[PDB]
Amino acid sequence: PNYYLYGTVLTRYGLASLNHDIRRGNKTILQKGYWNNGKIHSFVGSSAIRWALRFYLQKQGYLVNRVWDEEEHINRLTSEDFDPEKFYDDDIFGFALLPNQRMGALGMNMAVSLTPYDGAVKLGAKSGREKDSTSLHFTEYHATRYQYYFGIDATHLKDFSRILPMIDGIMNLPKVGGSSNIFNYPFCPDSLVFQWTNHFASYISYCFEYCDPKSKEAKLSQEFIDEVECGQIDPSKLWIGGTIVKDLQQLDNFESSPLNKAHIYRNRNEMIEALKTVIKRDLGL
């Protein structure tokens, strides 16, 4: 049976300067665009998160075709002929020669800042004296939480057991490409909404929303909650974990709401263990 794991995760609050766009003169332009309310929202490309997952696989065994040198800052291919049956990288992220080309078992969307970006510019100078063209520069940051939506087709995997390392890596994401030296932003999630269903219909994409401009309270939603109440998104297939649990359990009439009978764990590790148990049972691992 076809099984898909859709999920929207919310990162912790902090200053993030990770997806510089093109650099415009003296400034490193944080990538941003219009979103939701017609306000400018900073973005983190999904390719950055895929690279982070690739690095997570490489750092802990998990034979991968692409090897990040981490010293020469180059990629080396163990086998020029991609073999999804052997390598986790080719199996999960796919490839393209330009053959087989795969299709990719993991689909991801660009991470979206939960808050509009006002100006958030940081000055930078190089010590003193003998000042040159590189002495003065500016860097754009952003003090919000980032939110991205992903979906992994478990059945499309060459090896079904490879879905567990993706869950572990998503919950233990390494440095997502960015100015880690100056703006160290952990991309591990503090709020999760996972759906382990068996049809290609997900209504949890970008569920988290708070607006409230400059703040970090990060309420879940009203449209997603209404979707849960109306009858679809059955709570048996819904997995909610993280700091959003504290806000969810403090809502009025929560005990009578259908959202109560969903798999809700305050501890992320416990919910991940339960979800992995369910996945292993369903996939015959």
Binding site: R24, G25, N26, K27, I29, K32, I40, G119
Partner: protein
């Protein structure tokens, strides 16, 4: 020429006068050396104009630059028209006009 064309030309002249004032300020501040750079100033102005990402930031930068320009006689003669044009028009079109004024600028001999 239509009234829109007249206001557009007056805005071009206003921006050119503002650049004249800013470049004169740079010249006065950087009299040392063989000659203060001129092409570098234009590149700086272009980069700063392209930095703007939304209406608010671009209009803030435009007002700041216009005031830094100085007297700006063409703005003296046309308070209401130019003010309404800046407030009303989309910021992308105003940026296009400002860059056209930059390109069509003649440094004082």
């Amino acid at each position: 020429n239509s009234e829109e064309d007249k206001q557009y030309l007056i805005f071009i002249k206003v921006f050119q006068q503002a650049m004249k004032g800013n470049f004169a300020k740079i010249y006065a501040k950087t009299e040392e050396g063989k000659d203060p750079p001129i092409k570098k100033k234009v590149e700086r102005l272009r980069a700063e104009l392209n930095y703007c990402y939304d209406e608010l930031s671009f209009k803030e930068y435009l007002s700041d630059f216009l005031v830094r320009g100085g007297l700006n006689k063409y703005f003296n003669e046309h308070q209401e028209e130019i003010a309404l044009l800046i407030k009303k028009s989309p910021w992308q079109e105003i940026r296009i006009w400002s860059l056209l004024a930059i390109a069509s600028y003649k440094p004082k001999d």
